[PDB]
Design a protein around this motif. Structure first.
Motif, PDB file in Angstrom:
ATOM      1  N   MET A   1       1.208  -0.942  -0.095  1.00  0.00           N
ATOM      2  CA  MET A   1       0.304  -0.191  -0.084  1.00  0.00           C
ATOM      3  C   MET A   1       1.183   1.674  -0.077  1.00  0.00           C
ATOM      4  N   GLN A   2       2.265   1.070   0.781  1.00  0.00           N
ATOM      5  CA  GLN A   2       2.929   2.334   1.048  1.00  0.00           C
ATOM      6  C   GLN A   2       3.406   2.829  -0.529  1.00  0.00           C
ATOM      7  N   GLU A   3       3.266   2.124  -1.577  1.00  0.00           N
ATOM      8  CA  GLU A   3       3.478   2.587  -3.266  1.00  0.00           C
ATOM      9  C   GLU A   3       2.230   2.582  -4.022  1.00  0.00           C
ATOM     10  N   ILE A   4       1.154   2.039  -3.841  1.00  0.00           N
ATOM     11  CA  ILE A   4      -0.287   1.768  -4.305  1.00  0.00           C
ATOM     12  C   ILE A   4      -0.425   3.869  -4.095  1.00  0.00           C
ATOM     13  N   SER A   5      -1.101   4.100  -5.026  1.00  0.00           N
ATOM     14  CA  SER A   5      -1.522   5.640  -5.196  1.00  0.00           C
ATOM     15  C   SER A   5      -2.304   5.782  -4.131  1.00  0.00           C
ATOM     16  N   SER A   6      -2.532   6.590  -3.279  1.00  0.00           N
ATOM     17  CA  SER A   6      -3.043   6.825  -1.977  1.00  0.00           C
ATOM     18  C   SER A   6      -2.619   8.026  -0.774  1.00  0.00           C
ATOM     19  N   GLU A   7      -3.975   8.553  -0.922  1.00  0.00           N
ATOM     20  CA  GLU A   7      -3.261   9.947  -0.306  1.00  0.00           C
ATOM     21  C   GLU A   7      -4.073  10.653   1.080  1.00  0.00           C
ATOM     22  N   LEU A   8      -5.204  10.583   0.409  1.00  0.00           N
ATOM     23  CA  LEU A   8      -6.434  10.977   1.535  1.00  0.00           C
ATOM     24  C   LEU A   8      -6.588  12.079   2.253  1.00  0.00           C
ATOM     25  N   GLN A   9      -7.355  12.585   3.216  1.00  0.00           N
ATOM     26  CA  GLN A   9      -7.036  13.603   4.245  1.00  0.00           C
ATOM     27  C   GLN A   9      -8.742  13.336   4.951  1.00  0.00           C
ATOM     28  N   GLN A  10      -8.397  12.728   6.130  1.00  0.00           N
ATOM     29  CA  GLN A  10      -9.846  12.374   6.883  1.00  0.00           C
ATOM     30  C   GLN A  10      -8.885  12.288   8.934  1.00  0.00           C
ATOM     31  N   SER A  11      -7.941  12.187   8.485  1.00  0.00           N
ATOM     32  CA  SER A  11      -7.197  12.698   9.396  1.00  0.00           C
ATOM     33  C   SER A  11      -7.759  11.479  10.748  1.00  0.00           C
TER      34      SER A  11
ATOM     35  N   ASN B   1     -10.731  -1.862  -0.236  1.00  0.00           N
ATOM     36  CA  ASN B   1     -10.265  -1.034   0.795  1.00  0.00           C
ATOM     37  C   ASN B   1      -9.444  -0.043   0.668  1.00  0.00           C
ATOM     38  N   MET B   2      -8.888  -0.632   0.082  1.00  0.00           N
ATOM     39  CA  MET B   2      -7.601   0.484  -0.473  1.00  0.00           C
ATOM     40  C   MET B   2      -8.711   1.317  -0.510  1.00  0.00           C
ATOM     41  N   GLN B   3      -9.646   2.132  -0.850  1.00  0.00           N
ATOM     42  CA  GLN B   3      -9.925   2.984  -1.893  1.00  0.00           C
ATOM     43  C   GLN B   3     -10.378   4.006  -0.886  1.00  0.00           C
ATOM     44  N   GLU B   4     -10.626   3.968   0.322  1.00  0.00           N
ATOM     45  CA  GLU B   4     -10.528   4.468   1.053  1.00  0.00           C
ATOM     46  C   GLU B   4      -8.741   4.827   2.378  1.00  0.00           C
ATOM     47  N   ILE B   5      -9.038   3.606   2.861  1.00  0.00           N
ATOM     48  CA  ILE B   5      -7.283   3.316   2.887  1.00  0.00           C
ATOM     49  C   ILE B   5      -6.816   3.870   2.778  1.00  0.00           C
ATOM     50  N   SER B   6      -5.296   4.765   3.288  1.00  0.00           N
ATOM     51  CA  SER B   6      -4.033   4.858   3.032  1.00  0.00           C
ATOM     52  C   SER B   6      -3.395   5.339   3.847  1.00  0.00           C
ATOM     53  N   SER B   7      -2.380   5.682   3.578  1.00  0.00           N
ATOM     54  CA  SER B   7      -0.681   5.626   4.017  1.00  0.00           C
ATOM     55  C   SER B   7       0.310   7.106   3.619  1.00  0.00           C
ATOM     56  N   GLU B   8       1.177   7.544   4.398  1.00  0.00           N
ATOM     57  CA  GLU B   8       2.042   8.769   3.910  1.00  0.00           C
ATOM     58  C   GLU B   8       3.563   8.206   3.825  1.00  0.00           C
ATOM     59  N   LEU B   9       3.483   6.639   3.942  1.00  0.00           N
ATOM     60  CA  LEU B   9       4.819   6.166   4.218  1.00  0.00           C
ATOM     61  C   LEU B   9       5.714   6.065   3.121  1.00  0.00           C
ATOM     62  N   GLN B  10       7.102   5.857   3.259  1.00  0.00           N
ATOM     63  CA  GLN B  10       8.007   5.153   2.414  1.00  0.00           C
ATOM     64  C   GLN B  10       9.559   5.024   2.747  1.00  0.00           C
ATOM     65  N   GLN B  11       9.824   6.226   2.970  1.00  0.00           N
ATOM     66  CA  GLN B  11      11.200   6.133   3.485  1.00  0.00           C
ATOM     67  C   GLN B  11      11.991   5.564   1.827  1.00  0.00           C
ATOM     68  N   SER B  12      12.273   5.850   1.696  1.00  0.00           N
ATOM     69  CA  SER B  12      12.642   5.078  -0.238  1.00  0.00           C
ATOM     70  C   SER B  12      12.332   5.927  -1.321  1.00  0.00           C
ATOM     71  N   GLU B  13      11.997   6.629  -1.833  1.00  0.00           N
ATOM     72  CA  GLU B  13      11.652   7.849  -2.715  1.00  0.00           C
ATOM     73  C   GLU B  13      11.911   7.170  -4.364  1.00  0.00           C
ATOM     74  N   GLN B  14      11.991   8.201  -5.078  1.00  0.00           N
ATOM     75  CA  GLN B  14      12.169   7.292  -6.639  1.00  0.00           C
ATOM     76  C   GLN B  14      13.109   8.130  -6.965  1.00  0.00           C
ATOM     77  N   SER B  15      13.391   9.828  -6.879  1.00  0.00           N
ATOM     78  CA  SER B  15      14.585   9.752  -7.879  1.00  0.00           C
ATOM     79  C   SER B  15      13.568  11.991  -7.589  1.00  0.00           C
ATOM     80  N   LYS B  16      12.795  12.142  -7.963  1.00  0.00           N
ATOM     81  CA  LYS B  16      12.269  13.333  -8.464  1.00  0.00           C
ATOM     82  C   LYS B  16      10.590  13.640  -6.713  1.00  0.00           C
TER      83      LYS B  16
END
Lengths: 71, 71
Positions: free
Chosen positions: A38-48, B37-52
């Motif tokens: 999921m960390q890679e899957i396109s998802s951001e949301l904004q509920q907090s 459920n992915m449509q709702e649940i999300s995350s702002e983690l990564q700790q890897s990035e890509q390049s830009k």
């Protein structure tokens, strides 16, 4: 409800015939595997919003030492 | 068998002893359940990035596990 609502899934694994813990263990591996992606899957949301996901526990008896030398 | 790197998962379900199709079928139900459920649940983690993709961000909740789409 139960890991993205995996109620129906619990019945799928239980079908194999085990008990109850084995079934949950299976979903734990799959659900966890996908979550890691999921960390890679396109998802951001904004509920907090936060929520406690319970905790775990470990058992550990005492079992003292015996005492028998003479009497 | 490459939806979200569930290589180990296939081995977990196959352990029960079936054949090959049964194992894949199980992951199809679970993977499909989480994806819904992915449509709702999300995350702002990564700790890897890509390049830009650096800078910016926030100090608020990133998980946010709630269901509003349902009514």
């Amino acid at each position: 409800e139960t890991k993205y609502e995996l109620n129906n899934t619990k019945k799928v694994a239980n079908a194999f015939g085990l008990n109850e813990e084995d079934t949950n263990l299976l979903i734990n591996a799959v659900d966890l595997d996908i979550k890691n992606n999921m960390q890679e899957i396109s998802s951001e949301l904004q509920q907090s919003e936060q929520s406690k996901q319970k905790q775990y526990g470990t058992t550990l008896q005492n079992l003292a030492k015996q005492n028998r030398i003479i009497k």
